[PDB]
Symmetry: C6
Subunit: 102 residues, 6 copies
């Protein structure tokens, strides 16, 4: 997108949820002086790309075409139980098994 | 319901308990021009969906038709580490032996 | 007392200490319009039932009628080093051992 | 003690360190209307008893008669890396060995 | 580097995201009275050495020459589920294997 | 120490990084009433002894005579993801290995 402040850097921390950040990506767009085509594009390309790898891995898992409502339901668990319950055990139970890796 | 800010996005944080969020859902509802029925429908359909996979996993667990008194009570340990006394110990002990999942 | 803001909903949080809730419950009772016996009925009836599973499980353990000095201390362990150093960490081996559960 | 607020209940949270609370206990003493000796008695009896089982277990370990400088330095470890590193690990391997407990 | 309060110690906290700190590194460069060449130099020379081993280890992961955009995406992995779940799931299970180490 | 607030004992919280505690140790030295030599004498001794057992052990571990700059980078690695990744990884199996301890 490249529009100042609004999308070149609007990013989601790790504790910052996918839900709170989308506003950081929207409310901030309101600040950029862009055309609606300039913004809507910014919501498709830069949203998924510059936002929280816990969830980007979910945005490419759900994959494109997911409405934000889809990236919303799944990336809601970003957090200690929803995601982290599944994130700690995936690496923990994988490498333990590292003699054989699927 | 699709009413501004409340049912379009009122949400429950992964650290935010079933109570703080319930206050929000109830609060921004006072911000949308809504009748008594406008809000009663808004509670059942969105609260369960747009709210923290922890409580959301409990609300379905409660079985629809359970008064909020129950969504409150069951989702009380919902919590920062609270509910999770059951969430981490399971994910950490079901996947742990080899591959057996029950 | 079924008093507004004070009992019907006063509730201790998960990340929350027995203190601040006890303070919430206490501090607000003056705020309700009740009779003296009523309030006393709340300190004994609600304070245990509507507060923080790390600690509620304790209150039910030390038991009703136990001096607050006793409730306090045990529930002051709630919170990382006191209650936490013990329980899930033990829950790891309770379900690992799940073939046999005592 | 019984002097209003200061020593009847001044308590140390679980995550709250020995210094943050000791400060509460001290400062709150300045506010009570106690004789010089009243307060002196209070610093001893209530500082060790109503303060965070992590540090309280330490104050008992150091042994009564230790100056606060000693209670302080020792209790500073209360916290995740210094005190928690030790108890989680010990509680974990002490009971794992459960057939034999020393 | 040694320029006024910018590079003397601008350091990323262990829990401070790369993103949050880097600003303290940027705006401070803006905040000092340096020449344009000094600051450009201060970016590469100083941002990596003084930036939180979680990310200072990532800046090693990208491999020098990566545009900061790469440092941004990569260090965005700094965080609990992405970078902490890897050091928690890796370091714990590696040394466990200490009979044999690769 | 004995100078006001600064060196009598200035202390670091567990989560308090070397940037939240030491910074205090710095800003506060400008306030303590010390001779130019005093402060130089106090910046060495008190800084290492009264600060965060993780980092305190680091400052002693690098070995005296190291520049503080050498203690700063070296103590910026205090922290859960960074520092706890290393000690959490070891303490758990250090004792598991208790049949043989090296
Ligand atoms: O900082 P501590 O006193 O050592 O304890 C913390 C704290 O728990 P408390 O609610 O009891 O204060 C965190 O709470 P937050 O303020 O981060 O919400 C909790 O977080 P979670 O509920 O999200 O798990 C965290 O756990 P973690 O470091 O896994 O985020 C847990 O630390 P311990 O599990 O290490 O005791
Ligand atoms: C090993 C130790 C650090 C001590 C430990 C173990 C596991 C717990 C908790 C389980 N548990 C235990 C006591 C009190 C509560 C409270 F206060 F939070 F309700 C609670 O949930 N379950 C976490 C919830 C959570 C969140 C994110 C990552 C891991 C876990 C496990 C906390 C601490």
């Amino acid at each position: 997108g490249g529009s100042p402040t609004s999308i070149l850097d609007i990013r989601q921390g790790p504790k910052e949820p996918f839900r709170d950040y989308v506003d950081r990506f929207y409310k901030t767009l309101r600040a950029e002086q862009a055309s609606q085509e300039v913004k809507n594009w910014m919501t498709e390309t830069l949203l998924v790309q510059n936002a929280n790898p816990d969830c980007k891995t979910i945005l490419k898992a759900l994959g494109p075409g997911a409405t934000l409502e889809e990236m919303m339901t799944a990336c809601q668990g970003v957090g200690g139980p929803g995601h982290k319950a599944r994130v700690l055990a995936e690496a923990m139970s994988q490498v333990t098994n590292t003699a054989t890796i699927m």
